[PDB]
Amino acid sequence: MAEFSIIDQYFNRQSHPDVALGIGDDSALITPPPNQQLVICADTLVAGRHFPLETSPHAIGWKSVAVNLSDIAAMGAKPHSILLAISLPQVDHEWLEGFSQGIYDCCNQFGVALIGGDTTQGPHLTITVTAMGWIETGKAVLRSGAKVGDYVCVSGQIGDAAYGLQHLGHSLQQRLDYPTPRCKLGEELKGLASSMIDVSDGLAQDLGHILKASKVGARLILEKLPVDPVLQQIEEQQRWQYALAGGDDYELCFTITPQNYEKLLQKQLDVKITMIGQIVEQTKLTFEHLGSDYPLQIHGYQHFA
């Protein structure tokens, strides 16, 4: 099987009648919802860098979509559609079947259409998904906007995926392979969060982008960081390195006034939310453990580091 047959078999599997023009032409066409801005992002996953080489193709497909929906969610936007650019060295039908099932399972979970892409023979498995969302004009939640006194919160748990990576085969590998983009939470934070970012690199570094953009700092409370029971039972310095510098969480970190936090707590959310600290004037990220200053060195993720 060659390119065109591969696209028709694996990447044109569903009807999306609410899309003006899907797969089959030089470009896709989307009629915007009225009074909304386009929200758009792209993230690349490289085999052996963003996932273990032995990762199941279904997980690879899932995560390729999920990490991009996470950046849409981080703006407060509603995700709509994706493009899929996949480059791989050989036609492997078992692999293509699993991969495309992963793409579509993630798309279907979050109501997203696959409307276009590019299919390429290349020496090393590389996937770039583009995600498209829409938001009420002017209402995006930015990385700027955090104010002194705002609570710092994070969704779900942090550190799971990083622990999983260092313990392949452990149950927590599921959080590495199958992160959950917090799509509904992102939408529910529109109008409530004063700033937001998704946690791809590690809580400390990604919160750091908010702190820099907003020209503020934060004090975080280590015993409040939401970690898995498994990490609660390991050495605390190791625990907090996973939680704060592990990365691969794809949770949402956001700031919010006490006032708006009470409003948020009144909503029915599909993920837990944990208040983990507060924005301060001092432009430094500091940590405390049960009332005591806690010195902590955190190495962040960067390509070519």
Ligand X SMILES: Cc1ncc(C[n+]2csc(CCOP(=O)(O)OP(=O)(O)O)c2C)c(N)n1
Binding residues for ATP: 117-118, 143, 200
The closest residue (CB) to ligand X is 247
By C-beta, is 71 or 150 nearer to ligand X? 71
Q: Shortest distance, CB of residue 182 to Mg ion, whole angstroms?
A: 12
Distance separating alpha carbons of residues 5 and 12, to the nearest angstrom: 10
By C-beta, is 41 or 146 nearer to Na ion? 41
| Near a second copy by CB under 8 A: residue from 98, 116, 156, 277 | 116
| Near ligand ADP by CB under 6 A: residue from 71, 150, 160, 188 | 71
Q: Check binding of 6 to ligand X (CB under 6 A).
A: no
Distance separating alpha carbons of residues 39 and 204, to the nearest angstrom: 25
The closest residue (CB) to ligand ADP is 117
Distance separating alpha carbons of residues 131 and 78, to the nearest angstrom: 11
Element (H, E) at 102: helix 93-109
Which of positions 87-126 make contact with ligand ADP (CB under 6 A)? 114, 116-119
Residue type at 72 in one-letter notation: I
Element (H, E) at 82: strand 78-88
Distance separating alpha carbons of residues 59 and 51, to the nearest angstrom: 9
Which of positions 172-191 make contact with ligand ADP (CB under 6 A)? none
Q: Shortest distance, CB of residue 187 to ligand ADP, whole angstroms?
A: 18
By C-beta, is 143 or 175 nearer to a second copy? 143
Which of positions 160-199 make contact with a second copy (CB under 8 A)? 196-198
Distance separating alpha carbons of residues 298 and 158, to the nearest angstrom: 15
What six digits make up the tokens of 194? 């004063």
Query: Do 240 and 222 form a contact (C-beta atoms < 8 A)?
Result: yes
Q: Check residue 76 and report its DSSP letter.
A: T
| Near a second copy by CB under 8 A: residue from 14, 108, 137, 282 | 137
What six digits make up the tokens of 30? 């989307």
Q: Shortest distance, CB of residue 29 to ligand ADP, whole angstroms?
A: 11
What three-state secondary structure class fits 190? Answer: coil
| Near ligand X by CB under 6 A: residue from 10, 11, 51, 254 | 51
Binding residues (CB under 6 A) for ligand ADP: these are 7, 11, 23-26, 43, 71, 84, 86, 114, 116-119, 200
